[PDB]
Design a protein around this ligand. Structure first.
Ligand SMILES: O=C(NCCN1CCOCC1)Nc1nc2ccc(Sc3nnc4ccc(-c5ccc(F)cc5)nn34)cc2s1
Length: 247
């Protein structure tokens, strides 16, 4: 009876109706996960509409349809014309979504532009969590977490810095000439992702702070929302961001 308000009625995802447009994904823990995921509610977090075990379901996770799909594909699309302002605004929304999740003691572990969705208002939702979770991810993972398989909000912060880099390169693969088994050795040489051409200096400083070698010295998502909202406020949407030819 704790899962009833999560329940609705009369793998991979497919379309769906109720009208409201949705995405439908396809036993005690499933009903538990419904209730927990149902408790997360923030404009920059993908909400669960409800679940279907009936009858028998499969089961079925029903999520709001995101008109514009994943953030990575959206910024990569050559027919899109984002400004510095737009891209930073997307980063600011992810940071707000993560500040909420961190407040709920939730550790994402797979924060990446591919795992964020965009609705018809271009509101960014952090997704790929709860029932909707699916597939290492080496290139987004904090150094300590690669080394110890332990994940924290401070390791999400490192991931968020890589996501900002994605944003500012319009979806370039991070560390392209680097193979995933070798990323630990590469970083321990004293290396970070390079400053994208259309990345403002203060935002590259923010990325570098997100990648601080001491997890405790990284900014919280709350300090990131504050810092990024200030940077965002200085732009007016006159700087068009192009794609690098090498990526
Ligand atoms: O795809 C669209 N819109 C069409 C976008 N088009 C594409 C063609 O270009 C024109 C614009 N809406 C959708 N809403 C939803 C709502 C929920 C879910 S499941 C889920 N839960 N967490 C995550 C996290 C990531 C992914 C994911 C990753 C890579 C991808 F590639 C696609 C989706 N899924 N995911 C799927 C969809 S898909």
């Amino acid at each position: 009876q704790a899962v009833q308000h999560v329940v609705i009625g009369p793998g991979c995802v497919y379309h769906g109706t109720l009208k409201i447009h949705c995405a439908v994904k396809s036993v005690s823990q499933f009903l538990t996960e419904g209730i927990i995921m149902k408790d997360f509610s923030h404009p920059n977090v993908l909400s669960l509409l409800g679940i279907c075990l009936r009858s028998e379901g499969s089961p079925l996770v029903v999520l709001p349809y995101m008109k514009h799909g994943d953030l990575r594909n959206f910024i990569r699309n050559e027919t899109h014309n984002p400004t510095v302002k737009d891209l930073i605004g997307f980063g600011l929304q992810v940071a707000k979504g993560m500040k909420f999740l961190a407040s709920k003691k939730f550790v994402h572990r797979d924060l990446a532009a591919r795992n964020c969705m965009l609705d018809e208002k271009f509101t960014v939702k952090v997704a790929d969590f709860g029932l909707a979770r699916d597939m290492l991810p080496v290139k987004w993972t904090a150094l300590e977490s690669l080394q110890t398989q332990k994940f924290t909000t401070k390791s999400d912060v490192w991931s968020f810095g890589v996501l900002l880099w994605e944003l500012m390169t319009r979806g370039a693969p991070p560390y392209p000439d680097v193979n995933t088994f070798d990323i630990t050795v590469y970083l321990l040489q004293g290396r970070r992702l390079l400053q994208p051409e259309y990345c403002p200096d203060p935002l590259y400083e923010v990325m570098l702070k997100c990648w601080h070698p001491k997890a405790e010295m990284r900014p919280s998502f709350s300090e990131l929302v504050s810092r990024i909202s200030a940077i965002f406020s200085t732009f007016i949407g006159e700087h068009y961001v192009h794609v690098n030819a090498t990526y």
